[PDB]
Symmetry: C2
Subunit: 283 residues, 2 copies
């Protein structure tokens, strides 16, 4: 139904066993992983990091530890460990087109794939036709927010994305409960990106690409500068970046990290600062 | 760039080694397969037949022999043999999202995948990280006809799809070299189906689906009855079926198999007759 769960570089996923949508791959401690009941905590979320030479991925937990899924060669166990770029920490993600099921096949020893056991433990094993070696990937951000109305807070202070009443200009402002501060998030299948639609005027959060660096709202023309990528912070699934479809380097940004009402929301070159960190919450 | 090469049930493909797009899997004799340089024979074309229970496919050669790709258990050789629905004749097709490369992994013994050797022979083997176990799949019809102008002959007699002068109607007619007998075929990424635009008037071949069985031409609105699926005959890649996106059971049909100039063209329930068999030729 959607291409939003495709195995894209730099997206974040729940990894579930094919036999149970309510369990997910879960970092349970400093080193151990297991299948666990789905709670949508950061320790159940995994960023894919593709290497184009190997055609394989690293699988990184998003609880801010930066640990990656690791085959404990020469044993049959798996863990989460420091990224040392080991062959044993790379995994092919090879997908069945119809069912969407994926094998997670080790790069160092491609005889071996990830397997889930009856008792919810994980291991690597030689390959069989059992469903205990098939997993599904669901994109966390799409699950959280697609076709949903949201408040969007700057990390800098308790202030939200606000469309001006006279202008179509976007600023940060305190919570009014106003429709000018509420945004309908919707994935576009064809662009493979999001629109954010102000509830007040039913138009798209827009980087005015022609004019300069200003972000406001604008007509629903579907121009390139009206589409956005929404991701978690590189290491941390408690906050989000919002970057523009027209230029990936351009991130939604509070001008000069201004803390007060009315301070302008723009796009700015990618920098890692708190000015470009946001908190999207569903209403 | 295109979803047209996706590993769809009931499509026909060239199967290429990842290291060379000019080579394809070729049935060279009654029982043997080998990589060969890409030519135009139906012995280099393979239909996928998916089993929902197995999550795997049979891979059927299209030279009208009906033979399918077979692991010669317990040896390491492969061949083409009579379809017995053997576990050794089913193959998982598991694909890498970014590169589009596919492993061809045996259902009976999933330790084993198809491998191409430097001498162009094929075998099965335990899995490695080598490019010699990665294949590309290219949809033959898309490669043959996308964005090209074609003539379309009924199998019944040497006559062609023809938009009449005085109406929107389509019939079969003897060849005039007329613009009204020429059809631009173009795949639509969203619909995952083709349009056929009459060169004379820039209109889509269209089933008038609200009011009867008639096929003619109509304005480029992009309605469901203006899109078509183009496939080879189930067994035989010298001829084609053309069926309607609106309702897949409705196939392009020469009314009552009339052989004469002006015989109407319609859609009709799938029945395997010569009236529903066409010959598409690129001009």
């Amino acid at each position: 139904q959607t291409n939003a769960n495709d195995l894209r570089n730099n997206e974040v996923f729940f990894i579930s066993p094919s036999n149970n949508t309510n369990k997910v791959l879960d970092k349970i401690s400093q080193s151990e992983v297991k299948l666990w009941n789905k709670l949508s905590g950061a320790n159940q979320k995994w960023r894919l990091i593709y290497d184009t030479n190997k055609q394989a991925y690293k699988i990184k937990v998003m609880d801010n530890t930066s640990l990656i899924l690791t085959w404990n060669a020469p044993l049959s166990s798996v863990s989460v460990k420091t990224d040392t770029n080991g062959d044993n920490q790379y995994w092919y993600l090879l997908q069945n087109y119809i069912s969407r099921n994926v094998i997670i096949r080790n790069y160092m020893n491609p005889n071996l794939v990830l397997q889930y056991n009856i008792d919810d433990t994980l291991m690597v094993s030689t390959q069989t036709s059992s469903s205990n070696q098939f997993f599904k990937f669901s994109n966390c951000i799409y699950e959280s927010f697609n076709n949903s109305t949201c408040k969007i807070q700057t990390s800098l202070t308790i202030k939200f994305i606000d469309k001006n009443q006279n202008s179509n200009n976007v600023t940060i402002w305190s919570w009014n409960n106003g429709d000018n501060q509420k945004w309908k998030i919707l994935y576009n299948e064809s662009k493979m990106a999001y629109t954010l639609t102000c509830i007040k005027n039913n138009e798209y959060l827009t980087w005015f690409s022609s004019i300069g660096n200003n972000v406001g709202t604008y007509r629903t023309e579907g121009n390139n500068d009206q589409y956005w990528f929404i991701n978690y912070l590189n290491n941390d699934a408690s906050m989000y970046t919002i970057s523009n479809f027209s230029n990936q380097s351009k991130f939604l940004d509070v001008v000069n990290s201004g803390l007060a009402d009315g301070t302008n929301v723009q796009v700015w070159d990618s920098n890692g600062t708190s000015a470009q960190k946001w908190i999207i919450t569903r209403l």
